[PDB]
């Protein structure tokens, strides 16, 4: 089984996830909408609105991503090991993992049967695009909550992001999170390469991030759509 | 500098 | 055949056709700033095609009691009000209607507003798809029992007759100049005008429609007007009931009721 | 006298 310390680490992460991830999106409010993926909105009363985009959703996506990232910042802030870090490292780690942590969270509300992200009263529907493949591949592994939250930790405490001072401490923390994940898998799951499959997905996800940031910077120069918080994340001025 | 170019993050982190 | 109409009949059809062109925007291009349901036999879904190619779709709630069964009525009120302003204009450009004293103009418009809207709406009704195509808007019926509701049957029946524009416009004239509406002083003049519009319609049909599929067309048309006068009574009664509980009508509709 | 109870109609008719 797992050491008492490993059990405390998983517990701390699971509690942070609970306190900071509203899976029903009940508090996602006042977002922009394209004026009068496809987007579905169910009202409390039974009505459904549907947007089919042309053969402009970006203001809305920016609002969604921003809501997601605020939750990620909170997640991080609840973790003791992250709190102990100097402020500039906290910023550099969050700038480096924001995209990845959002995607991992979004994976947990992705339905592979219907190709839909089910975000409370909202749904996004639509796979050689790497982002869509990632969601299918990651979903096929059928990870537990605890595996997701350890993947988030491993992505957050990456020692090699642009601007990290405490590289050695962060590398140590990453490795303890990885060992706990390896052990969690040994003690609960044949699934003989699951841990490495998880790490390969992180790597792929680190590469989609690069591509997607490049694309979003291009679009943002022509047609500005990003929230203030996104602009900070992208180094936009 | 890093905190100066990320005022909102900084703020959200401090609360 | 075509020229089997008197000069006077030809000028009447031309005046009416021209009034219809000037006052019926079939593309609804200027229908703007309407209410929309926020983010039961006549239940429709609503479709909005943006200039850019995108579509928005409203599917309305199922019947879960009420308070939401009328979700679309503010919007229908806004549509109806736009329709009626077009109907007022149509009337206003007709010489015979202009000559009438203002109170009769009001009383005729109060009495026919519903009928003229319906007739105009029939021209953009697609019987194949059960859809009214109103420019970038569409209203679709949900899913043969829809033929129970007299309003729906009317649209399907009227559409099956395949009338020409000129026939629609003469139907509108005949409905507008009804001598027996509640409040008409010039009852006799109005009855004379109604009959000349009916005779022109009969002649128009004689001089343009030889086929067995149009046997009795004129009388079919007149029976449809009569039925439409009766659905109006029923529908006004319903709308008054709904309006007392959940006020939805525009100032112009309130006046008309 | 329907003109007082139908102000908007009256207006639209005068235009
Ligand atoms: C640095 O922080 C970020 C960087 C991002 O893109 C690189 C994004 N981001 N990721 N995807 C987007 S997106 O292009 O709007 C988008 C959002 C959602 C989807 C799905 C629902 C998966 C189809 C596809 C694409 C954004 C914006 C979000 C954050 C917080
Ligand atoms: C006398 O003035 C009117 C009276 C009306 O109802 C009796 C209407 N009216 N008729 N139907 C409606 S409605 O219930 O909003 C409505 C209008 C149109 C449709 C369609 C979708 C075309 C079948 C369904 C329901 C109104 C309002 C309109 C005017 C202008």
Numbering used by the authors:
A (entry chain A): 142 to 177, 211 to 229, 238 to 308, 319 to 381, 385 to 432
B (entry chain C), D (entry chain D): 682 to 696
C (entry chain B): 139 to 177, 207 to 310, 316 to 429
Task: Provide passages from the article that reported this PDB entry.
Similarly, we determined the crystal structure of the hPXR LBD in complex with the agonist SJB7 and the co-activator peptide SRC-1 (CPSSHSSLTERHKILHRLLQEGSPS) at a resolution of 2.66 Å. The hPXR LBD displays the canonical α-helical sandwich common to nuclear receptors, along with the characteristic five-stranded antiparallel β-sheet unique to hPXR. The complex exhibits a homodimer in the asymmetric unit, as observed in a number of previously reported hPXR LBD structures, with the dimer interface being formed by the β1′-strands from each monomer. Protein chains A and B are similar in structure, sharing a root mean square deviation of 0.727 Å over all atoms. The hPXR LBD adopts an active conformation with the AF-2 helix (helix 12) positioned to favor co-activator binding, in which the SRC-1 peptide is seen packed against the AF-2 groove of each LBD. SJB7 resides in the highly hydrophobic ligand-binding site, with no hydrogen bond having been clearly observed. The t-butyl group makes hydrophobic contacts with W299, which interacts with most, if not all, of the ligands co-crystallized to date. The ring of the t-butylphenyl group interacts with M243 and M323, with L209, V211, Y306 and L308 providing additional contacts to enclose the t-butylphenyl moiety. The triazole group is fastened in place by a narrow channel that is ~8–9 Å wide and is formed by S247, Q285, H407 and L411, which reflects the plasticity of the hPXR LBD in molding to the shape of the ligand and may contribute to the favorable positioning of key protein–ligand interactions. The dimethoxy-methylphenyl moiety forms π-π interactions with F429, in addition to F281, whereas L428 and F429 form contacts with the para-methoxy group, which is also engaged with A280.
The xenobiotic receptor pregnane X receptor (PXR) is an orphan member of the nuclear receptor superfamily. The activity of human PXR (hPXR) can be induced by many structurally diverse chemicals, leading to the transcriptional upregulation of drug-metabolizing enzymes (e.g., cytochrome P450 3A4 [CYP3A4]) and transporters (e.g., multidrug resistance protein 1 [MDR1]) to enhance the metabolism and excretion of xenobiotics, such as therapeutic agents, and endobiotics, such as steroid hormones, bile acids and glucose. PXR forms heterodimers with retinoid X receptor (RXR) to bind to the promoters of its target genes. The transcriptional activity of PXR is enhanced by co-activators, such as steroid receptor coactivator 1 (SRC-1) and transcriptional mediator/intermediary factor 2 (TIF2), and repressed by co-repressors, such as nuclear receptor corepressor (NCoR) and silencing mediator for retinoid or thyroid hormone receptors (SMRT).
